[PDB]
From a paper:
A glucosylglycerate hydrolase (GgH) identified in M. hassiacum and found to be highly conserved among rapidly growing mycobacteria is likely to be responsible for the rapid mobilization of GG accumulated during nitrogen starvation by hydrolysing it to glucose and glycerate. The MhGgH monomer displays an (α/α)6-barrel domain typical of glycoside hydrolase family 63 (GH63), to which MhGgH belongs. While the active site of GH63 members acting on larger substrates is located in an open, solvent-accessible cleft, those of MhGgH and of MgH from T. thermophilus are covered by a cap domain (subdivided into A′- and B′-regions) with constrained access through a narrow negatively charged tunnel. The crystallographic structure of MhGgH revealed a homotetrameric architecture, which is compatible with the oligomeric organization of the enzyme in solution as assessed by SAXS.
To avoid substrate hydrolysis during crystallization or soaking, three catalytically inactive variants of MhGgH were produced.
Residue numbers in the entry:
A (entry chain B), B (entry chain B), C (entry chain A), D (entry chain A): 2 to 446
Amino acid sequence: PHDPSFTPTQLAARAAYLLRGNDLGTMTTAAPLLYPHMWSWDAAFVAIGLAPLSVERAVVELDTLLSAQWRNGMIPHIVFANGVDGYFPGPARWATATLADNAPRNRLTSGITQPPVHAIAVQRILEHARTRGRSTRAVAEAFLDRRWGDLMRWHRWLAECRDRNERGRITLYHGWESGMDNSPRWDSAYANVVPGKLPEYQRADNVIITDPSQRPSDGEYDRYLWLLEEMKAVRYDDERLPSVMSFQVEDVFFSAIFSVACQVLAEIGEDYKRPHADVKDLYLWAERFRAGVVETTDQRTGAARDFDVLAEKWLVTETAAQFAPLLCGGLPHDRERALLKLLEGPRFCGHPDLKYGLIPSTSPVSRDFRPREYWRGPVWPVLTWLFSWCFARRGWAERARLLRQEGLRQASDGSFAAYYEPFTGEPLGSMQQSWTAAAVLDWLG
Amino acid sequence: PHDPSFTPTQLAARAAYLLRGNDLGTMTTAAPLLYPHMWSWDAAFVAIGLAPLSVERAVVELDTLLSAQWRNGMIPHIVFANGVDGYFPGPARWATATLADNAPRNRLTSGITQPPVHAIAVQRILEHARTRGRSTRAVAEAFLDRRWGDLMRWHRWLAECRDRNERGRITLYHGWESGMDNSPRWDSAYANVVPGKLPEYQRADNVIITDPSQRPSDGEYDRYLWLLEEMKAVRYDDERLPSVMSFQVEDVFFSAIFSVACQVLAEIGEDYKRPHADVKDLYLWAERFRAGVVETTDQRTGAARDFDVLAEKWLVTETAAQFAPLLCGGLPHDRERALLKLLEGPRFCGHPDLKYGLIPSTSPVSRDFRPREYWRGPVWPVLTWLFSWCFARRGWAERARLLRQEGLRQASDGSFAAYYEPFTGEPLGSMQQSWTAAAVLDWLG
Amino acid sequence: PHDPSFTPTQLAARAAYLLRGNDLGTMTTAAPLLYPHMWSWDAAFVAIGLAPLSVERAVVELDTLLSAQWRNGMIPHIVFANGVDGYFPGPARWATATLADNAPRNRLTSGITQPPVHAIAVQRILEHARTRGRSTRAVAEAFLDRRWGDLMRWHRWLAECRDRNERGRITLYHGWESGMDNSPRWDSAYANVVPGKLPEYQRADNVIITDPSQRPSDGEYDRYLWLLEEMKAVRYDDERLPSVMSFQVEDVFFSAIFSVACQVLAEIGEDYKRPHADVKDLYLWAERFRAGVVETTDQRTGAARDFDVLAEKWLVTETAAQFAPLLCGGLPHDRERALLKLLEGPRFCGHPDLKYGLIPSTSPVSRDFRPREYWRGPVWPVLTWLFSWCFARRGWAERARLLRQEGLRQASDGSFAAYYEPFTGEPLGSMQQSWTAAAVLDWLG
Amino acid sequence: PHDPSFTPTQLAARAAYLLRGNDLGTMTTAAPLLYPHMWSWDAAFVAIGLAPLSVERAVVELDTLLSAQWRNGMIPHIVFANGVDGYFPGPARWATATLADNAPRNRLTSGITQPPVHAIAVQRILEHARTRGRSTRAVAEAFLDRRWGDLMRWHRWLAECRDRNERGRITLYHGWESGMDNSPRWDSAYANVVPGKLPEYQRADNVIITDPSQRPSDGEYDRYLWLLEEMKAVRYDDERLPSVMSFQVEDVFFSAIFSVACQVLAEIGEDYKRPHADVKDLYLWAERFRAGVVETTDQRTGAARDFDVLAEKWLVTETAAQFAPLLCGGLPHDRERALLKLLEGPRFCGHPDLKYGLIPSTSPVSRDFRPREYWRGPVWPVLTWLFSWCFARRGWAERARLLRQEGLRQASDGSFAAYYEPFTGEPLGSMQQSWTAAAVLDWLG
């Protein structure tokens, strides 16, 4: 009535209840109906959220994701649960089981990737396990033994197959691989995607989320599915993709996350006495991608830019991805201060009409801003979590705390939505999103 | 390491995670392996624990229990889950599906009852629902519409078939119906139970809990199962039980709980405009059983006594059941003060060697005291919860708070055991007991 | 910026800081500039707020107040601080030092009384002290040893000198004795006060609080100050007041507080082995003022009425004092349900325009309602505290909890105002009021 | 009885109460009787603890200290309260009023300095003020307007007059300037101090703290007081101290604090548009003292060493000051990992007999260890605070969190002692120390 908000203990109870309720056994769905399968970076956040509840079950979540790793090392962005429809495109549309020589043996997966936040999840699992004493340390350490090789292959595939020219930036062949499907970041590269004879299909996402203003448009889905056809024609071969894909972009946010991930995994590798050549490689990649992100930045404002490889041009947009260099470090001192002024100013977290001091996915003063439409404007708790966690790693303890405080205040209604209207705070999209529950559990401690 | 305790937010997350993890779908198991079925007063506590998480799912728990209600109104103490063994005695041993004319149609149940804390669970569901606004009120109110008649039949069967002589005390035909299976309260009535040709059996409880000191003895289980044979020979007929049962005791704690339950249900009946004749009946029974409890009490100390109907004599023991009149009210002023001095003194919560200021199931200075052996000594969070909740109803706000505080401190290790060693605090019995998680969730708010 | 509220630990620290900052040494000012002396029922609340900080200093607050008790047992409503100016009427205007035979020696006080919340403060000090160990328990028990007799004289003076006809209601000779200076309760009685030659004077209160809408009018002060002249003319003699005072009312809210206080003090006397004759007297007065309160009640709603002794007529007004019977008990069951419906419904706590679910001092739908004007409408935390504490004592734990919760939400701006606009929540009157900080400290525990 | 600890809100309220109770008006005593004056780095911590209570009063604390700054820029380590006795050496013994050309007018102070934590307090005040709205931000920014120049003079006096050879390490002329009076760090330097005709005196400190084991010896005080004679003989002249002082050491912990403070103050100067030349100087000193600290470090463990300027030899001792490089950064990566292993391992935080996971002032396995004797072993909350705050600044959020958490667990008895027995946790020295209450308030947020 007068106050729909939950106390911190009630909120944490409700978050954990949701995470257990989305558990199919060995995998957690990203959202009950909209996303009834295991998604890659959702799964990393799910492991973070499970680590305060059960280190064993947190490890099981990453074990399950890594059992779907491709033979070349790629972690695919969807691992389908057996016998669940209601999500399109499903395994039949991707047909990776048929066409992809590198697809895993006893798992149905997608044929594209997603950002490598997994090392961050490993770090949080270990930190939790170190507070719970010997028996629980052993579980976390036995996981390292079993899966260090697989994490290395994941990072090595990113470093070697998606950074072919050693530019220190990750090439994507689908906007879906960025995690920000309809970000304004990809508008001009999608504008050069002309579909051919695209086999018939029926959207399923917008039977669940029926507001047209909160999901991508039909025109946008026709480009998304057409790119799948181009990958399928080359049997998802890494070598042939540069030659065929109509969409090839260097994703500076994905690159900054990879840089952080390598640094984190390198430190884990040192503390647990993993092979020295692996630690050296991880430190090498963290520096290469840190430098690769810095090379994209505006020399005045520090804002990071994506790069359209096909058009051979810098993509200038006003989204939250501009702040990638804040995550990984590396900017000159003056350029970083300017970048923090942009973050805190009226074009983003300082905008006067925002309900919370949180980072909007697109700047509200940008011509591309749409307050309800997914990544074109709404506020995402997963960005809040990622920025706050990276900010604290930079030593910016008070910036990290303020983002955490406002994220808890936004989440304190218990909707656990993936994104929120930035002016009114209305939950948008699907409720019961596992990784919002995870972020809340991590923040509450 | 230095401190295995969880923060209040971590504890509440872990409690809710456990409650969701014990959910089979429509019922919650009392404990994963030891009690892999739905138990009656555990189920009431489970509903209390679920009400802060989901009023819908809390209502579903009570709906499921009430679907197993017998045709005469009795709520049986076990509702078996389909296809689960590992618990003895199971449905085949009870054979209620064959023999009991009143057994429910499409449910396997036991053939005995357990204390009526269910109205208390209904009260907590309603109080939660009133803080969550219109949609959630409707769910709680629609439950009242569907199940008020069934709750009335439950209370009426207790009042009419287990208080045949209108003495205002509940007769039990099995120590299991008290919830305190091996309490010293029943030793002398069990001593007059001589088993006959008792069909062969194998205990299953002590394959799971293998410490012999924490479960009842083999000699005690032979009496428990022999009483089942006596009920089976009369096909669980209410009319014939007084004529055949070797164990017939008036349980003063069960009676005090019934008195409170009637009072609570009567107030619910008034606030939601249920039939006036039902409210009148409930108030009648609450007073009759309040008086029935007071009639058992020592005129000096106020301690309540059980009554062995067969031996026709008062049972004097030093267990927590002595404090039944504190729950329901009714004692003269001086007698109640004396009873509170007994509770707070060195024979119970004031005993110098107790780790927490909590109520031991048997007095530590009693000859019957056994520090590890189930109801002969250990501390049970479910008694802590019940006393604290009833104390606050009496207006004893600070006594209730102190019991709550110490219960949270004991539970703060996250074992969620049903009972604890009273001197060392060691968790005993089964971990992951649903109703300890429920008590914690209720207390934390 | 985005969130003006403090966290619970920040709020608690700011409340304790305010209380120590208003400490003059052995007495706490009620407010820094508006009320720069010790007020009697503020000092009871200050004692409650000091108890979690220092039992020694809480006892000192009450010792200081009781050292200013009159020879006939009356506790005056102001104890003036040595040398302090800026409040009118000051010691010069009261002239109790010269005129009042019963006034204390070497303490300057006023010449009227105020409600007897003091036993409640004594209970909260004892409950705090029992959690703190032996030396702290000794401090509290030595305070009882030396002031029990003074507390009895206080209650005996009320029962014998302000209830001379043993009606079980307290007569007041000044609206300031009710604690609700300008309440609509007193308007018709004040209409019969006709000042004669009133010696001139300048207000001090509205030089500090200069908004005219938040304090009484000049016309009201003329009547307040004339009643002082009438008392002085008979040198504050108890026996002469009924024959000379133009204001003589029975205060049912004061009477219900006294009923509760007698019962509280009686229970203390039993627990700490005080003279049996004293405890009997206290229980006798508890019951008599309970009956006196209930005798006033509306036959349909159970609402309590004040009584004008000179006019011999019931005073019907729509203020929070109507709910007096909820505090002390005594209504038949159906009338108490009606009275709680009145409290929770749209004339009081459930009015739709109210920011908080709290009790306005006057009904927002009464024609006497004024949203800014002191006791004519604003929400007072002291009343929130009293009802919540009294409701918990009645055993209405959820109702007490909801009041506490809204009270803390209102106070979380750290204003510590004594009253608040009911619709906007704007803090009114003086900031830095000790008894609001005290309420907050008691609630946060 | 069963649980001596306070809840977080009770702890916070008791800390704020202590801080206001030690407030003399415009300065806070360090301790009520032991240290009844303003100490310089306590006053920085007091300012940190006041910031969540009152930004205005926090600023006043720093204004009062800076009004006692010497004409050459030095902040003296004691500012004496007008008319206050009971601490020796008092203003008479220092005689700075008569002898010291640079001493302030109309403030009595000591004649030595103390570590420069003050910029850290300024940062915490600014961070608090930015969360509180415009008028509060104006208070903090007006404080910078009027004291920025004084803060620069402070840092410039340290860099130019106590680092005359631009070695990037601060020279001390008295162990009291380190803040660690009787630390084993200084024993070999104090062995070269040979008192001549020392004017007689009586200790005041051990009349308050009478256990001989918790304070320095008479022999140590004879040396402390002789160094005062040497300073007075040259009238506290900076230029003459190197030629006459028998104690001259480079304090690496002080130097690392100064490095951090310069960098903090430089960032403030950038954010608030202070003169660019000032910010350049601050970053220059930050780097120079960082390098000076690292130059001292053990080549295997990275542990920092103090330097005895008269003996020209590195001082190797096993105290917490060895961890200075963790505060300011600068170690190569592999040496910092070794130093953190030393900190967390069995010689310091991981010693098995330690009650809390906190940093003992001397290693429990060193032969200089004494568990009760001031800086020779006990655990100090101020060090816990400094390392946690500095660790968070390095980006080691989990390490900073674990220190905070153990610090709060140690403080939860409400003793507010300045140091604690490391094995039993017994509070030692004076209770009611302001800077421990300050630490607690900052941690609880």
